[PDB]
DNA sequence: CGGCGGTACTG
DNA sequence: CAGTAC
DNA sequence: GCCG
């Protein structure tokens, strides 16, 4: 299937250096050529062949022919030594390519360095806490209680409440780093007000044991990422995100959580291509105008009372959640 | 060359 | 606003 | 990094 393994490889092994040292549009390059050389139905031959490539031009060539030739690349040698340090502290939920690069240029270089020296944020602070436990993916089945555990807990608020997990779960994979529920009713407005309840009864029962983001100030809450446990003995503690949206989102929700991310980016960039914008709420067709520039013309919503609609309105054919790690990729079936 | 998704918290 | 996240 |  991926006839190119060698040489994606060593080009990850790049983009990852590139990422964690906020490179991020170069970051972003490398993980499109990538993809494509993953697509390709056939080993790369020759240098042409590879700029003939949508997402490869002359240096990712360079690099790949070099590879393909000489076996090795010469550049992973030159990577900066700080970037290992790098990647770890960005592991860190919350700490981010900054975060980490103020760390390195005060001396720290370990986790320890970070626990007993660094100033946290408080959601880094948890983040440290459970670094180990938020790096290893679940396995599906896990996944399936957590989101299950949620749905109860709703139910038992409303039993027309819909509950579904999202994210990697929804497209199939073995194992989720993360689980994403998604929460909604058809009768379009009793979903409101959820998030109180529904965080209490998953705290009273000790199931959530920390909250990274929530603002419980606001009624109208419509996100929360924290942290939940399985009851038993030896469970890990897992990153769980939950949203609550209007059923008229419900589509545009299912799909933006869903995902992938690179599948979303693409569908949106595309949206914006023919006039319109794709958000988590909503597909507008909504455009620019601004007296000499351009600016805010919020443009009224598409009803796109399922995925397949926004499908079709952005001329494409419904793209199976298992099939949606990106758009440019065509999988046949 | 400039743009590269669109949005929601936290501090 | 900057940083980080989804 | 690549693309229009
Ligand atoms: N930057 C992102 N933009 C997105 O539109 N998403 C959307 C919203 S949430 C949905 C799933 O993303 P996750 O980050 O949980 O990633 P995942 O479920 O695809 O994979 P994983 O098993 O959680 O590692 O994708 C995520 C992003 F990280
Ligand atoms: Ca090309
Ligand atoms: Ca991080
Ligand atoms: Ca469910
Ligand atoms: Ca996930
Ligand atoms: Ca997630
Ligand atoms: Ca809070
Ligand atoms: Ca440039």
Same mark, same amino acid.
């Given at each position: 299937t991926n006839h190119n393994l060698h040489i994606t490889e060593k080009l990850e092994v790049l983009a990852k250096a590139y990422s964690v040292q906020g490179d991020k549009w170069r970051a972003l390059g490398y993980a499109k050529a990538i993809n494509a050389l993953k697509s390709f139905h056939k080993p790369v031959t020759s240098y042409q062949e590879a700029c003939s490539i949508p997402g490869i031009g002359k240096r990712m060539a360079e690099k790949i022919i070099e590879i393909l030739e000489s076996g090795h690349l010469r550049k992973l040698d030159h990577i900066s030594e700080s970037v290992p340090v790098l990647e770890l502290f960005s592991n860190i939920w919350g700490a981010g390519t900054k975060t980490a690069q103020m760390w390195y240029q005060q001396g720290f270089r370990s986790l320890e360095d970070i626990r007993s020296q660094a100033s946290l944020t408080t959601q880094q602070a948890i983040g440290l806490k459970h670094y180990s436990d938020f790096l290893e993916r679940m396995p599906r089945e896990?996944?399936?209680?957590?989101?299950?555990?949620?749905?109860?807990? =709703? %139910?038992?608020?409303? /039993?027309?409440?819909? &509950?579904?997990? &999202?994210?990697?779960?929804?497209?199939?994979?073995?194992? &989720?780093?993360?689980?994403?529920?998604?929460?909604?009713?058809?009768?379009?407005?009793?979903?409101?007000?959820?998030?109180?309840?529904?965080?209490?009864?998953?705290? %009273?029962?000790?199931?959530?044991?920390?909250?990274?983001? /929530?603002?419980?100030?606001?009624? %109208?809450? %419509?996100?929360?990422?924290?942290?939940c446990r399985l009851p038993g003995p030896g469970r890990r503690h897992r990153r769980l995100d939950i949203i609550v949206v209007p059923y008229s989102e419900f589509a545009c929700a299912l799909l933006y959580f869903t995902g992938s991310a690179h599948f979303n980016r693409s569908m949106r960039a595309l949206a914006k291509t023919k006039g319109? /914008?794709?958000?988590?709420? =909503?597909?507008?067709? =909504?455009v620019v105008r601004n007296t000499h520039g351009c600016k805010v013309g919020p443009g009224r919503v598409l009803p796109t009372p399922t995925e397949k609609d926004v499908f079709r309105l952005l001329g494409l054919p419904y793209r199976e959640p298992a099939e949606r790690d990106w758009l440019e990729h065509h999988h046949h079936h």
């Open positions: 896990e996944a399936t209680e957590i989101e299950q555990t949620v749905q109860k807990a =709703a %139910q038992a608020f409303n /039993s027309g409440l819909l &509950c579904v997990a &999202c994210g990697s779960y929804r497209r199939g994979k073995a194992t &989720c780093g993360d689980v994403d529920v998604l929460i909604t009713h058809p009768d379009g407005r009793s979903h409101r007000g959820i998030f109180s309840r529904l965080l209490d009864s998953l705290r %009273q029962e000790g199931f959530l044991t920390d909250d990274l983001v /929530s603002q419980e100030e606001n009624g %109208q809450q %419509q996100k929360y990422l924290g942290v319109m /914008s794709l958000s988590e709420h =909503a597909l507008s067709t =909504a």
